[PDB]
Design a protein around this ligand. Structure first.
Ligand SMILES: Nc1nc2c(ncn2[C@@H]2O[C@H](COP(=O)(O)CP(=O)(O)OP(=O)(O)O)[C@@H](O)[C@H]2O)c(=O)[nH]1
Ligand SMILES: Nc1nc2c(ncn2[C@@H]2O[C@H](COP(=O)(O)OP(=O)(O)OP(=O)(O)O)[C@@H](O)[C@H]2O)c(=O)[nH]1
Ligand SMILES: Nc1nc2c(ncn2[C@@H]2O[C@H](COP(=O)(O)OP(=O)(O)OP(=O)(O)O)[C@@H](O)[C@H]2O)c(=O)[nH]1
Ligand SMILES: [Mg+2]
Ligand SMILES: [Mg+2]
Ligand SMILES: [Mg+2]
Lengths: 426, 428, 428
């Protein structure tokens, strides 16, 4: 009962999934072949939500892997828990986007999507009652953006009554991978406004910061980042997969943290984050967990949260905790930061508690916030777009796929409007 | 699955190509026999059981340069169907290569190309090595380029051209050759990279500490650079840069598609022990005026876009820092409309070194292909050179004899002139 | 159970035939002695205990070419009853072969044929090798053909004829010979295959890399082709193509029964190592204008039907793909009334190679016999050639002397002319 099939796209998204899946397997106790070796009985009662029980007791991941080139699918098979995945579910093309959303969304992706649109249906049929789809991709390039975007809107025609999650990675100003980020972002966001129910905007610039100072890691890699990001995902859907004193599923969360139709972009956060040095000396108790969580530099979105107010705020705690300890801390925080919470929505807090913790750690906190400080993330992008679009630069790649210069300004306008919605209520 | 077709035109193309081939062989652990004692699938197709033939076509109007390959060590690597040979040479003339002699050979090769091209499934794009100043490398290439837009069109093309020098140039009629062959390059070629021998020579002298270089030392250098373009395809790094992606990134406008390369570090075997190769230092090396592949001035120029490609021991943590530092500096500067101007590639595989090589064995290496207004000034003097030559109808009668009408010259000069202002317009 | 009778007429037929015989011997593991140290039952009959005699009849009006076989290595394979010999030759004349000399020899041979034919039970069909330009190969064949419709009629016939070339032809009076002998071919012969020496020569030069070929190299080539027709009978592949079946498939109308052959791959021993022989490539090779057995133009022509026959390592999975690809291409094109135009054959047995052979040992091989409008244009120039010769009564008196009436010429030219339009009519 209550199943969620997972979708993946892009070079980064796929990688994230690869780690995320592994982590989830570890949490339940699934091995590379698929046979169960775990001891705790409650891992097997909600195994059905993320694993179909196949023949011979070998569980399989309910997933769809998409790409416009075959390069990334090579390393996913050879790595750990690549053998658990079903051969049928891998989808891939021979062309590739080439860091262009125009090629990705119309010409290249629309030929590949019809295979996936048939594959997902089967998955849907398989489970008793599907409650929502998780989606993992990037907005920086053309492959993860153009394809995923194309897909997500066509799901709303067949399944209008289901919740829609999207785990994205938006561009940073300092750590700029590609040149045409402003373009891709500008166009890819447009469709994610009306079609999605919730979106987690992650940024690598913040991740790096988190890594250098807090974890004290001398040589970070993308692997670390993947591990981090996956943790967040694990956190949000913990209440479904395990019992608890106060359970909070996805729909509930959505209802609580999305007050208005067009303002649903969130910012993830994770705690506790401890190095080898801070593992010994940091006293892991609820208050400690709390304070760390609300720090500006501990966020995964590279902004200044304290420029504006949080519209809503929710948290998902794990491991056994006393509720007077838990529920008081939030209140205290609110009291402290009376200038950093919206006044006309009194009592902004939402809490959730799980009995089964992460293996090794005693407690954990996943922070999902909704703020007016997302303006800083978009504003810069808008500016960049303006700078680019003024001289019609890098345009012949997009215009070659049959896109008018008006069609840029149509999405641009929408983006602007969206941005304004935050500054309406700030 | 992925694949790419290499083309080699003229003597220069042939000469360059051999070194590249050797390098490739070294990389994948293949002796000249063609049997290895996967990654290599792009350039090599496995025939039957243990015979690796290259994706290649060598065109030449003489027999001398092609028969050099047939008699040497790499006799076993190629077969006579791949190696095409003319009778009468281009004779350092554009008109001989395109109109008179060019009709007969191209026909033979197109079929061959098709045979090679239809065999592979995942065509990424073409590579065409030549020289602008050369006879065959100008007259045939132009024809060839024209031909290739009919059969393919959208499928990508690249060319690594030997640009002529204002001071050290080894032929008298080179000015003419350049001006004509650039007419076809603007319409057909998607992005052409440019290298000057003079620039290379300086590098060879100063950094490598070999005051007696010949073509074999330059060829090797070039090959590394070439590899650094294709290294993203053949090996799986943490982050990848395909050819299409590169094109999307670096080339902003329809008229401008002439970035220039640079390679670092390039140092002696003894110099590697003392010199601690850091990432930042190597980054800096790419932006130095001394290490540029063309005779140009980065101080006058402004980078619109430039694509970094790291291979060896690299991670993104300090790469970002390096990127930031460059941005912060004001000696390096960009155009107002491009706030974010880099494309960054990474690879795990270290860059190989040739037996008896001038370059030292290193951990890291970089290759920046920068589109800029620095190279805009390079043709201003070329034009001047050309104009003077033309002004008194010098060397014209030969050209006329080969079937070149007088208006052709008018067409090619005016166009060139028009193009020079485009850069200015963009950079205002 | 199945059986077929081979006939060899003239010098050319003899010359061709020897090579074929040798090939056959090689195939079934039989030395010249005729005792093997089943499949072979078709062409060889086992006499008593370990004596394999061929189904053969060599006709010739000279002793020279037949006595070449009697003195050589294959002296043990034949006996004087099989080898018929005249006295006075045809002398490169149709009239000498048919009317004057042809009465005496044919009588002897018909009885012999009967003796051979009644011995075997499962008569598939006849094979008749000759040349149109030859004296004996035209005058006798016509007579012979006429004779064979009386005794058998419905029982099938084939002939592999050496067609004359417009440029490289080794006799002056050839035009006349062709025109006359085609009168009998239209009525009697069920399907005649045509090969031109000039076409072969080019192939020999370009692909095999032997610039000094003689008849022995052509004969070998021909023999392979011949085998590729009969290979379906003697070996049990997954799918089979009998002679009757082939006839049903390829020949649409009563007038048109002149398809042309092609064979691939044909390459040197050194070229086999580099060249990865794929199925698609070999398919392509059959449709190339360079590899055709007759001087023709596939670009002007349209294929009504064409029968592919694969032998070696082949399966239907990629064959289908190959078929589809050709259909998709527009350079190859068909007539409107024929939507599906191929007949596909397969065989497990690999094609053998002769000791000291020019051809390389290969896994796969193909043979396409295509009925087309390309060969319709070939006789337009022949007619022209003939007409000029006739216009001033050149060489006519000799013919007249041998008992040829003047109206015969009129009959044969007009008919030919009429035939040329038939193709046009069909292809409109
Ligand atoms: N957390 C991670 N972020 C990554 C990783 N690799 C890249 N990135 C970030 O994502 C951005 C690039 O995303 P992608 O490579 O997936 C672009 P996309 O695949 O959609 O198009 P193509 O590259 O044309 O296939 C870039 O700004 C990086 O900062 C990774 O392994 N982990
Ligand atoms: N870097 C480098 N440059 C070369 C090499 N060989 C020739 N060049 C340059 O190319 C120009 C001469 O072009 P060629 O390739 O000899 O001329 P071509 O196009 O073959 O025409 P023909 O010589 O008439 O057949 C000169 O300006 C040389 O500096 C080489 O091996 N390396
Ligand atoms: N391909 C091929 N063609 C041949 C061969 N021998 C002869 N020819 C061709 O056949 C024609 C000559 O015909 P012949 O067979 O010599 O003439 P004939 O019918 O035997 O008549 P006579 O020579 O008078 O006995 C020429 O145009 C040759 O090109 C051969 O071994 N191979
Ligand atoms: Mg990708
Ligand atoms: Mg030369
Ligand atoms: Mg004779």
């Amino acid at each position: 009962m209550r199943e969620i099939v997972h979708i993946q796209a892009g070079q980064c998204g796929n990688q994230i999934g690869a780690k995320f899946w592994e982590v989830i397997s570890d949490e339940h106790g699934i091995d590379p072949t698929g046979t169960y070796h775990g001891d705790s009985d409650l891992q097997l009662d909600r195994i059905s939500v993320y694993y179909n029980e196949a023949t011979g007791g070998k569980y399989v991941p309910r997933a769809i892997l998409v790409d416009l080139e075959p390069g990334t699918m090579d390393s996913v098979r050879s790595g750990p828990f690549g053998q658990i995945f079903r051969p049928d579910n891998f989808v891939f093309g021979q062309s590739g986007a080439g860091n262009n959303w125009a090629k990705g969304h119309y010409t290249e992706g629309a030929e590949l999507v019809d295979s996936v649109l048939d594959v997902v249906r089967k998955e849907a049929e398989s489970c008793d009652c599907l409650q929502g789809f998780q989606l993992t991709h990037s907005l920086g390039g053309g492959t993860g953006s153009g394809m995923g975007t194309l897909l997500i809107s066509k799901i709303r025609e067949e399944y209008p009554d289901r919740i829609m999650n999207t785990f994205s990675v938006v561009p940073s100003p300092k750590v700029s991978d590609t040149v045409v980020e402003p373009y891709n972002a500008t166009l890819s966001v447009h469709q994610l406004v009306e079609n999605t129910d919730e979106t987690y905007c992650i940024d690598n610039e913040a991740l790096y910061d988190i890594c250098f100072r807090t974890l004290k890691l001398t040589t970070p890699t993308y692997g670390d980042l993947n591990h981090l990001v996956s943790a967040t995902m694990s956190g949000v859907t913990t209440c479904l997969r395990f019992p608890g004193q106060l359970n909070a599923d996805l729909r509930k969360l959505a209802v609580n943290m999305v007050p208005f139709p067009r303002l649903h972009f969130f910012m993830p956060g994770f705690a506790p984050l401890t190095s080898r040095g801070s593992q010994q000396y940091r006293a892991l108790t609820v208050p400690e967990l709390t304070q760390q969580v609300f720090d500006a530099k501990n966020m995964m979105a590279a902004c200044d949260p304290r420029h504006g107010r949080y519209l809503t705020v929710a948290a998902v705690f794990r491991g056994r905790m006393s509720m007077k300890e838990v529920d008081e801390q939030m209140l205290n925080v609110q009291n402290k930061n009376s200038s950093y919470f919206v006044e006309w929505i009194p009592n902004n807090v939402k809490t959730a508690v799980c009995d089964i913790p992460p293996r090794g750690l005693k407690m954990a906190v996943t922070f999902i916030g909704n703020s007016t400080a997302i303006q800083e993330l978009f504003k810069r992008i808008s500016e960049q777009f303006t700078a680019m679009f003024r001289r019609k630069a890098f345009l012949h790649w997009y215009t070659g796929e049959g896109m008018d210069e008006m069609e840029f300004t149509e999405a641009e306008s929408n983006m602007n409007d969206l941005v304004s919605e935050y500054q309406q209520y700030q | 699955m992925r694949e790419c077709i290499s083309i080699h035109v003229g003597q220069a193309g042939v000469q360059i190509g051999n070194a590249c081939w050797e390098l490739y062989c070294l990389e994948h652990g293949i002796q000249p026999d063609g049997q290895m004692p996967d990654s290599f699938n792009t350039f090599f197709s496995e025939t039957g059981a243990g015979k690796h033939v290259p994706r290649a076509v060598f065109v030449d109007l003489e027999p001398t340069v092609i028969d050099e390959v047939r008699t040497g060590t790499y006799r076993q690597l190629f077969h006579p169907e791949q190696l095409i040979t003319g009778k009468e040479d281009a004779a350092n003339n554009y008109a001989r290569g395109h109109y008179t002699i060019g009709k007969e050979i191209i026909d033979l090769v197109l079929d061959r190309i098709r045979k090679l091209a239809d065999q592979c499934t995942g065509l990424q794009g073409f590579l065409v090595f030549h020289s602008f100043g050369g006879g065959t490398g100008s007259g045939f290439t132009s024809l060839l380029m024209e031909r290739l837009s009919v059969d393919y069109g959208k499928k990508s093309k690249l060319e690594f051209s030997i640009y002529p020098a204002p001071q050290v140039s080894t032929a008298v009629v080179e000015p003419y050759n350049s001006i004509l062959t650039t007419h076809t390059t603007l319409e057909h070629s998607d992005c052409a990279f440019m290298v000057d021998n003079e620039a290379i020579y300086d590098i060879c002298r100063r950094n490598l500490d070999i005051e007696r270089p010949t073509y074999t030392n330059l060829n090797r250098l070039i090959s590394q650079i070439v590899s650094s373009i294709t290294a993203s395809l053949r090996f799986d790094g943490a982050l990848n840069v395909d050819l299409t992606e590169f094109q999307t990134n670096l080339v902003p406008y329809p008229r401008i598609h002439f970035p220039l390369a640079t390679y670092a570090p390039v140092i002696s075997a003894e110099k590697a022990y003392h010199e601690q190769l850091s990432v930042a230092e190597i980054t800096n090396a790419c932006f130095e005026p001394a290490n540029q592949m063309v005779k140009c001035d980065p101080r006058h120029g402004k980078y619109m876009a430039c694509c970094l490609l790291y291979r060896g021991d690299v991670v993104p943590k300090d790469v970002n820092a390096a990127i930031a530092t460059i941005k912060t500096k004001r000696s390096i500067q960009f155009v107002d409309w491009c706030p974010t101007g880099f494309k960054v590639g990474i690879n795990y595989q270290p860059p190989t070194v040739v037996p008896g090589g001038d370059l030292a064995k290193v951990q890291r290496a970089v290759c920046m292909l920068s589109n800029t207004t620095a190279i805009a000034e390079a043709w201003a003097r070329l034009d001047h050179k050309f104009d003077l030559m033309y002004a008194k109808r010098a060397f014209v009668h030969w050209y006329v004899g080969e079937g070149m009408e007088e208006g052709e010259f008018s067409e090619a000069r005016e166009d060139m002139a028009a193009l020079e202002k485009d850069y200015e317009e963009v950079g205002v």
